[PDB]
Amino acid sequence: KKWFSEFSIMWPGQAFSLKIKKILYETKSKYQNVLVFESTTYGKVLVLDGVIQLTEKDEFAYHEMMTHVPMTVSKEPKNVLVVGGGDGGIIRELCKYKSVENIDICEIDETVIEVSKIYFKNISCGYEDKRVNVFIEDASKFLENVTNTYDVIIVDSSDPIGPAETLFNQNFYEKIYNALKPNGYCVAQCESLWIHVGTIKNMIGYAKKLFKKVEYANISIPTYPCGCIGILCCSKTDTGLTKPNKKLESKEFADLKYYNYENHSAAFKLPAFLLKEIENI
Amino acid sequence: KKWFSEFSIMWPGQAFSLKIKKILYETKSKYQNVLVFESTTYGKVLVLDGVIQLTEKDEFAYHEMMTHVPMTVSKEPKNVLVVGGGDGGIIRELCKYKSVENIDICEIDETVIEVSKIYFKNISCGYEDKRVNVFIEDASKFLENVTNTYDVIIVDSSDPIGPAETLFNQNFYEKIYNALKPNGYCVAQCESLWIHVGTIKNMIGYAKKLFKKVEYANISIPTYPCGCIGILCCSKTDTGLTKPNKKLESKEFADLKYYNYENHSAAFKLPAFLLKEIENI
Ligand SMILES: CSC[C@H]1O[C@@H](n2cnc3c(N)ncnc32)[C@H](O)[C@@H]1O
Ligand SMILES: CSC[C@H]1O[C@@H](n2cnc3c(N)ncnc32)[C@H](O)[C@@H]1O
Ligand SMILES: NCc1ccc(N)cc1
Ligand SMILES: NCc1ccc(N)cc1
């Protein structure tokens, strides 16, 4: 048995590895290299341009926290946009809210969707929901063109090298601002406090040029580099996203494996050094 | 340049790797294999039996949280025992409390101490403190024999395979109980919620057979497996260790890089699935 290893200039000097039970599918799509394997201990794994995007064992931690943070703060969210997220995990979590009327997803690479429907059936099951509408386009252009405004936008992107390069700049954050309702919320994958503090500061800086309240929360997930991933949180009201306005008690949420009411606020209690770096932006 | 890789039957199917700038020292001590290298991005690294024990870039997260959790809850701690901890990082953090009168350390392998004094000078600097007394012995025997009782015991062990095998059993926890003051606290390295839940349950079960209040807290640290490490927390009073009784405001604590008042309590807000596994023990 061989091993998959995740090396990158975005985290030089380190690498994480998973033992391969069997390769399931590889291809070169119009945007990126796509790989899918069954690991010996983390179940199935999806890779894009050499970088791990999810595994069945732990994806629930990142998908539950990116979704339920903003969706327990938003009072009555009707219309939600997912940027990126071809795997469908966010969408799966959004579907659990009966009151949601529409879920748009803008994903640049339809191969990701198709591969996920074929190889990750418990992650892509929400595509079946009649409220979901798929657009295959660069979200940088989609957000320049869209007529609707959203109650919540969840930016489930890949990393800045590759097709997501258009999603980590000031201009993208203006477009997010303009496409949210006046009391709307954005959350965005914002990388690892252990090694990407220069990025994190830039992103916070971009977001603060527009939004009243910009916060940062941290998620424990073994299969992203350094064992964790941040959520950059944007709010038009001074109140922000650390405090849920509701509990998730109905039967659609019984199965939740990471998120709960308490760890929502916990996730925003950051390490001393990050606070010190962040203040003064 | 070669890479160091951390493979183990304690985390099958995964491995974490660091790029090696230069090997500094290797030996076979009476208890274990010892390796020290300078990494390209994490600074210097100490390995024992193929397993990473610390790196200069991140050790502060594990050393600050294991120490300051219990030391902000203990009202006036006079006498503290460190089990394991040859590197001296706990001791470094303990020395910052002026009111501490004595710090005992029981480490089985003196080579670890010596290597740390030579190669990790900002981690071992606390050995110079006149309050510190070193015993070279298996802590399982030391705790059977010691006459003093402690206000706080910090069990900074290596993993269960190797010489620390005597420290992950019921009998060790009775010895810890008997060597604490009647209002005394123990904290112990208790592994990763992502992959060691069977262990975590056993340890909680051992601790609950004796202690009034057993809690579990989680630390984000990129260089342990799965990106995180737990602290098993033992308390003789129903009040427990989630809430600090003091703030660390004096000049000896200004330099702290992870711990603060808020993230003390945050660290005990665990993922939904762990709560579900833990309840009923
Ligand atoms: C896998 S979840 C992350 C997803 O982000 C998608 N992605 C990257 N860049 C963009 C973009 N500019 N617009 C929409 N989706 C993107 C990737 O194709 C990937 O499927
Ligand atoms: C490096 S911090 C962990 C330390 O635990 C020490 N250790 C392992 N087993 C025992 C034991 N039974 N008693 C004391 N120290 C131990 C190891 O030698 C190591 O230096
Ligand atoms: N789309 C989530 C994600 C997070 C971190 C990394 N590296 C890649 C994907
Ligand atoms: N002594 C701290 C420690 C924690 C986890 C592992 N694996 C090894 C050492």
Residue numbers in the entry:
A (entry chain A), B (entry chain A): 41 to 321
Quote from the publication:
The complexes with the aniline compounds and BIPA revealed a new mode of ligand binding to PfSpdS. The aminomethyl N atom is positioned at a hydrogen-bonding distance from the carboxylate O atoms of Asp196, the backbone carbonyl O atom of Ser197 and a water molecule. However, in this case the distances to the hydroxyl O atom of Tyr102 are longer (∼4 Å) than the respective distance observed for the putrescine N atom (3.2 Å). The aromatic ring can also engage in a π-stacking interaction with Tyr264, with a ring centre-to-centre distance of 4.0 Å. The binding mode of MTA was essentially identical to those found in the other structures. The results establish experimentally that the putrescine-binding site may accommodate small aromatic compounds and not only aliphatic amines, a finding which, together with the other results, may lead to new approaches for the design of SpdS inhibitors.
